[PDB]
RNA sequence: AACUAAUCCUAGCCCUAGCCCUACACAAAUAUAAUUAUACUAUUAUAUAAAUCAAAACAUUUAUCCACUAAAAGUAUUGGAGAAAGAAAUUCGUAAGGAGCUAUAGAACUAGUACCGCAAGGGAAAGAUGAAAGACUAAUUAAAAGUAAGAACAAGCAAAGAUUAAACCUUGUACCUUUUGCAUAAUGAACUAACUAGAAAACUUCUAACUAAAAGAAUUACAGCUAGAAACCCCGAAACCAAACGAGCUACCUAAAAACAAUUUUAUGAAUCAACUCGUCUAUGUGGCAAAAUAGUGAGAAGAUUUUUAGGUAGAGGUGAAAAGCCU
RNA sequence: UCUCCAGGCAUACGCGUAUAACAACUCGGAUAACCAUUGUUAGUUAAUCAGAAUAGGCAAUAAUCACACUAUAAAUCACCUAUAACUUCUCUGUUAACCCAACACCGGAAUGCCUAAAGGAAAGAUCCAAAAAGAUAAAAGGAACUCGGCAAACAAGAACCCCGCCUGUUUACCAAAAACAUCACCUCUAGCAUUACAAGUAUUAGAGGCACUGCCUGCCCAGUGAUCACUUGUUCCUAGGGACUAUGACGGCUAAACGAGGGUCCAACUGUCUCUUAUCUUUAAUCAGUGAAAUUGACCUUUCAGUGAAGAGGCUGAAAUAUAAUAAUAAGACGAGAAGACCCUAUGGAGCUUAAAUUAUAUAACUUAUCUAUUUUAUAGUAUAAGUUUGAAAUUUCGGUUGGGGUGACC
């Protein structure tokens, strides 16, 4: 006679049964049943200063939209790194070892914002 | 009787008939006399003489055996020196 | 006496007996799940 | 004795 | 699922909480009938290897003091806490044992038999033939497994060529080596047989459940006629 | 695992019967491996080893099927790899002894690459292949750099 | 002169043919009591399929169940030599459609959903306007049973011969199955709509083609041989075996717990008697309030007591203060 | 505001929006008003209520007001030694008349506190019929009723027989007992350890039987001499010679006590009865709303005699006879329902019992082998095979004729 089709949540079951609704944990439970919040585990919203901002939620109809071109890795490379290498190649001051000079990162370890695996949320 | 066998879908011969009766192509069937090898010491000489003979079958018995045997056992067999050569045909019978 | 009230609901009893973890414990229970997935059932277990 | 029943379908007829 | 309560690795005098099995196996099926229920009981670990030297102590005869003679619910006989050196242990108590008495545990084997007071462990060879003994063991260093029930005693019938014959309480005669150590005297609670239960509910206290209500030779072929 | 007729007549009852091998545990020494293994072995294998004039000969000669054991197949790979590589680990500091063993079993020498894939199951072979072909993705940065350098170099040429 | 209703056509489906696959679904969560962001206790199919059934029983045995077409051939062989089973050698081969279904049909399917069972699991029903509803949702039909419009008028298997006349007069022992070839018996049917049960070619007969030969390879033949047409139902047990699923009811046990006023005895499976547990008797009820209750009356009520929570024992078994009692 | 009834507020398990207002008046409430129904909008706010670091060392002394007092069934992390870390508020539960019983079911449902301060309404309007159900009252009599003092009573007292010793337990939903358990008594089995028994060891553990308790009481107890010799007995060697032999499977019964046990008897008591009546509630009947079930070949559905299969609304011969409703009775319709009963059949089953037939690596055993140790053949064992011996079990079966049955028989 139990309803099998309804979702299993903490409102149901005895007192002992509990579970989260998806809220991210922000602290630790120490011995003796004491909660110790950790400030670093609490997200902090980085909010910019909007003074002098010239952009509003809606855009004018008169303004014409452009052609959609999903950005690709090749396109970014040509814009940023290709010109430096091209000029350097003419000057001859280019070597395989110093690709980092143009911005190459050998490993993501040591970066605050690791590209992969991502260590930063949206 | 197996009227339709699984592997081939054909009628199956009963081998109890093949080992007891002989069919002549005309349609007659031959058989032995039951007990011709049994307790011969107490049978009369005339009694034993009858048993040794080969006997024919009736229309019903012949009809039965024809249902329990397949056409292969109803064909013409050209055996050289066959001791039943002359008996496969009926002659001077009006009926 | 008066029958008909055999079902004495307890969520701890229910989930232990016919729950997901209980079913997966044995291959005979996992084959219960496997058939239910084949049929198309809304709920595979409790 | 046996037992079986049928549902009272909502049957909205507004077409 | 079924994990026996007997999981304590280290000896301690403190009573250990018990779990009864109701007769059920580790599979949950009854392997012995009539067992179930009764008062909650605490196990008191008993040392039957009387001559056990203390840590970093020479293996020589030593004495110990009988602190108290307690009642053990897990045995017919009554245990007695014995304190010696820097350790405390529970041992089975003899009939006349009293608190404050000193008992002797002696591995030393004497060529000449010496009269031994009740409760002092001595090798069977040391004991003169005919002395009442208890807590006898099959092999030296195996603990006691015979004559450890309330009021039981054993007789040292014969010592020959380093072999001792002991008449067990059932009158079975068992041979062991004279090296085996058995303390003198009968076990305590001699009057265990004289008790009267009186009421059915009393046996239900002890854990003995009621019995069920369910209520030959082959003659040889020649003998079938006469029967 | 089969059935028998009680009293060996087909007119009696059909009774389940299982026939078991008289397993024995013995110790065997492998010259190529220079190690002694303890294995459960039937009297049939002992005769086969004797007819093969040595434990090492028995393992190498017997095909995969006749051997009928995964443990034996691993021994086959180990012995074959030992001979294939002429590993100096066999009887170190005694080169004379090592040469004798290798020469005695020289007939079974096979290429090293083939020896590795001996006795492996499909899953183990699949795992071996996956590990060999595992590689972290090449950064596109480098890939574009190679293409750019080649194009620039060709243009200058 | 109409209510209840009826009419309807495409939703999908079925069997083939062709074809291995490369439909593995942002982000987040899930093996914890799944769908709970992080450490604790770690994680692993199965020894031979049985039986039903057939042998008019049953005990050896019993096609499929459990390796290319056709031929050899239902032959050799095997078999309580019974029912039955059954080769090979050796020959031969280049291989998108519907005299199907159309809403009780075709798949169970609008859906593995609702609903039912603790679980394994079982399992539905139905829809209908037109080109346009940004044209006030059409039509279409004395048409089923059932009613209404319109209750009835001595007398009788309800009708038939009749008749000027609906009824009066004359004649007349419902139907099927079933028993003997008899029923005033005995079974079955309130009525309507739809659905709902004879199937195979050895021998025979009939009709043709060619004819000592017939047949599009292997077959048969002392008029045969080849082809055609022509045949043998439905529903229903008690059971048996395999594998899952069940001890939230109930029997028993483990662990952690809780309840017991007042009175008299004493120091208790003792006494009076509530809560509470039980269920001797009578009455009512009997499709009941109830698939075991209600009203009274009774038994125990500090104990072998009652109750609560979680866990364990599972069918060739479990449990049993033995009633062959219990195990939803 | 009035009349009357007397389990209520929280908690847990459970349930899952049934909570609350508004709006509707199709559906649900078994009828209405009103909503528990439909749609929309809302809602339950916790650092206190509730739920969710490591390695060692070591504990004899219940509870009950714990003092006295005894008893027996023997009974709840802490504190130390060191290492590591040095200032925190997140997450989840919170509503309701609620759950298990197909139902807004006279049933089931644990704990805390309290017994009205909390919670509720037996009658929709009518009416006074029979029958039926419940309550109260009774002239005289007092069990004359009846299978029986069943039920009832202004009574609830006394003794007896039988059976079981007592308390206790059992067929959930027809038997609560005389049956099962039970203490005590008796019999059989086992000399022992790291998962039941059991962390136990013959005064113990398993298995089974039986009320115990003093008293009568079974047999069994070589014979004669007299702790002694012969005759016996038992064995060998050949009818001889040696050798050896120093009360327990049964009754009465205590005997008292106790019993929702089975029978009786006296006393009181009574509407049980002679002999029935009166009032009230319920039900009924009437008005209003709502709306089942078994059943049903068709029916324009009569009486008597005859016939018939213990049989006739319907056939045969007479007779009777305007049509319909409402409320009553239960003679007939072999009246309707049930998994009830009875005798017989089936080469239909299933449970139990073995002196049935066929098997039987459950177990135990031993034998020869294999095989490893050992000693020159030898005694040990055994990841096995082949036998022999028990049988825990599995499988299958219930011939025919004798008016039923056991015995005879017969085919
Ligand atoms: Mg139910
Ligand atoms: Mg319950
Ligand atoms: Mg008994
Ligand atoms: Mg068989
Ligand atoms: Mg058969
Ligand atoms: Mg039969
Ligand atoms: Mg359909
Ligand atoms: Mg369907
Ligand atoms: Mg009509
Ligand atoms: Mg007429
Ligand atoms: Mg009918
Ligand atoms: Mg049938
Ligand atoms: Mg439980
Ligand atoms: Mg019980
Ligand atoms: Mg009290
Ligand atoms: Mg009861
Ligand atoms: Mg009482
Ligand atoms: Mg009493
Ligand atoms: Mg009492
Ligand atoms: Mg009985
Ligand atoms: Mg059931
Ligand atoms: Mg509300
Ligand atoms: Mg309102
Ligand atoms: Mg109702
Ligand atoms: Mg609402
Ligand atoms: Mg709190
Ligand atoms: Mg609340
Ligand atoms: Mg009212
Ligand atoms: Mg009234
Ligand atoms: Mg009265
Ligand atoms: Mg009166
Ligand atoms: Mg009387
Ligand atoms: Mg009475
Ligand atoms: Mg009694
Ligand atoms: Mg009693
Ligand atoms: Mg009963
Ligand atoms: Mg009782
Ligand atoms: Mg009763
Ligand atoms: Mg009684
Ligand atoms: Mg009187
Ligand atoms: Mg009426
Ligand atoms: Mg009315
Ligand atoms: Mg009429
Ligand atoms: Mg009439
Ligand atoms: Mg009449
Ligand atoms: Mg009549
Ligand atoms: Mg008449
Ligand atoms: Mg009547
Ligand atoms: Mg059978």
Residue numbers in the entry:
A (entry chain 9): 14 to 135
B (entry chain 3): 94 to 188
C (entry chain 2): 47 to 92
D (entry chain d): 40 to 54
E (entry chain D): 62 to 276, 286 to 297
F (entry chain X): 87 to 243
Please give the exact wording used by the authors of the publication that reports this structure.
S-adenosylmethionine (SAM) is the principal methyl donor in cells and is essential for mitochondrial gene expression, influencing RNA modifications, translation, and ribosome biogenesis. Structural analysis by cryo-electron microscopy demonstrated that SAM-dependent methylation is required for peptidyl transferase centre formation during mitoribosome assembly. Our cryo-EM analysis of the mtLSU from SAM-depleted mitochondria reveals ten distinct assembly intermediates demonstrating how methylation can orchestrate mitoribosome maturation. During translation, peptide bond formation occurs in the PTC, predominantly formed by 16S rRNA during the late stages of mtLSU assembly and involves the folding and methylation of the A and P loops.
In state B1, the CP was completely mature and dissociation of MRM3 dimer was accompanied by reorganised rRNA helices. Consequently, H89 and H92 are immature, and PTC loops become disordered, blocking GTPBP5 recruitment and monosome formation.
